[PDB]
Amino acid sequence: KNMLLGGFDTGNIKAKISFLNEKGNIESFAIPTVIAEAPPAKIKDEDIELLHVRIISNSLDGDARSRAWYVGAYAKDQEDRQEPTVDEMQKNKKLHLIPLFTSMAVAAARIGKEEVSVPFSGGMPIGEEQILEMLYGEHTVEFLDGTYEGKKIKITINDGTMNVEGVSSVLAILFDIVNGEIVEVGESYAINDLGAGTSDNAFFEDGELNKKLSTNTDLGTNKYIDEILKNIKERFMPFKTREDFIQRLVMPEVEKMIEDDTYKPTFSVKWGPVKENVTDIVMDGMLKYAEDQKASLDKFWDKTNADKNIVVGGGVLFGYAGLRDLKEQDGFILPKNIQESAYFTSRSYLIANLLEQL
């Protein structure tokens, strides 16, 4: 007892976490990979809307040693916010450690523990031992504002794993944890995690990650979303972030499609004294993404000649209108519980971790 069990999926867009709550079920949320220096004191995923935390950890250095930060959403608005630098083609570790520890704390607060040991179960994209040791030790997160203002969580990380080999990265395709731990309603396979800014094409052969053909591209949903937004704003002549566009406009419709294959989606936008039907605009970007992904998956299938191709990630949902065709194709596997496709990897890392504890 007094332990937090989770799977951790980090990137340049979000830090994703899937953990076990008090009633033994999987709970998931994502903290945007954004931070900003904050004053020593105050001025459905409610608790991460406003994150102002003091973080004391030895994995942090210099001025970041034990000061305060705006983390995630509440950081994206700040002037001097920090985000992953990326050129026209570490010592930025706080940019990844801080949203990481912050997620561990939020989950800890959610389940009413104030001291938690967190066996680390995560992943790296194309050493393992060295990266883990920027995580070991004791980390304290105090909330200075928001839902858990005044709370102080002690995170202890003694043991970890990056789930490099074997079926660990995949486990969420076959299993689910409902008070633990139950089956969902080949020997050569690809895993395609379809994300916001990137697309991860990994290939597993004979129990081992094929560390030469396992690639990684920037085929993300974001560029397609930006296109759609540009075409909507022009239709008028609305949304604050992309996640706002996805959550408010896209998610409710993608969902009725899931539970009814006959349902036609409608996308309308209210901006000012005008309301427009932009169903045609949205669906265009969706199928464009779908076909571009269909093409990308095809050639990676041919390049690896995998026996089966698993497609996961939120891109399965954003491009669902087109990507649901992969259900009818032998050689492709979509998650049965497809509404959890976005957190497939973190959910997989969580399942790998629960097994590690046994």
Ligand X SMILES: Nc1ncnc2c1ncn2[C@@H]1O[C@H](COP(=O)(O)OP(=O)(O)NP(=O)(O)O)[C@@H](O)[C@H]1O
Q: Provide the mask over 157-196, with x wherever binding to ligand X is found by CB under 6 A and - wherever it is not.
A: ------------------------------------x-xx
Q: Under a CB-based contact definition with an 8 Å cutoff, are residues 149 and 143 in contact?
A: yes
Does 102 bind ligand X (CB under 6 A)? Our answer is no
Please say which residue, 12 or 188, places its beta carbon nearer to ligand X: 12
Establish whether the linkage from the previous residue to 208 is cis, with ω within 30° of 0: no
Q: Which is nearer to ligand X, 13 or 17 (CB)?
A: 13
Pick one of Mg ion, ligand X, none as the site partner of residue 331 (Cβ within 5 to 8 A by kind).
none
> Of 37-45, 85-93, 233-241, 315-323, which segment contacts ligand X by CB under 6 A?
315-323
What spatial distance separates the first Cα and last Cα of the chain, rounded to whole Å?
A: 14
| Residue range at the interface with Mg ion (CB under 5 A); choices 8-16, 25-33, 137-145, 227-235 | 8-16
238 binds ligand X (CB under 6 A): no
Closer residue to ligand X (CB): 111 or 258: 258
What DSSP element (H or E) covers 36? strand 35-38
Q: How many residues contact ligand X, by CB under 6 A?
A: 24
Candidates 82, 103, 104; CA nearest to 93 is: 82
Give which of Mg ion, ligand X, none residue 160 binds (C-beta under 5 to 8 Å, depending on kind): none
Where the chain is broken, by preceding residue (C–N > 2.5 Å)?
A: 43, 89, 126, 185, 237
**Which residue's entry shows tokens 């034990």?**
66
Which of these segments, 130-138, 142-150, 162-170, 310-318, binds ligand X (CB under 6 A)?
A: 310-318
160 near Mg ion, judged by CB under 5 A: no
Q: Which residue is nearest to Mg ion (CB)?
A: 195
22-40 burial, b at 16+ Cβ within 10 Å, e below that, comes to eeeebbbbbbbbbbbebee
Per CB under 6 A, 99 contacts ligand X: no
Minimum distance from CB of 200 to Mg ion (Å)?
7
Q: Work out which of 5, 35, 75, 246 binds ligand X, going by CB under 6 A.
A: 246
Sheet holding 26-32, edge to edge: 6-10, 14-20, 26-32
Residue 195 touching Mg ion (CB under 5 A): yes
**Ordered DSSP codes for 167-214:** GGGGGGGTEE-BSS-EE----EEEEEEE-SS-EEEEEEETTEE-TTT-
Interaction site with Mg ion (CB under 5 A): 11, 195
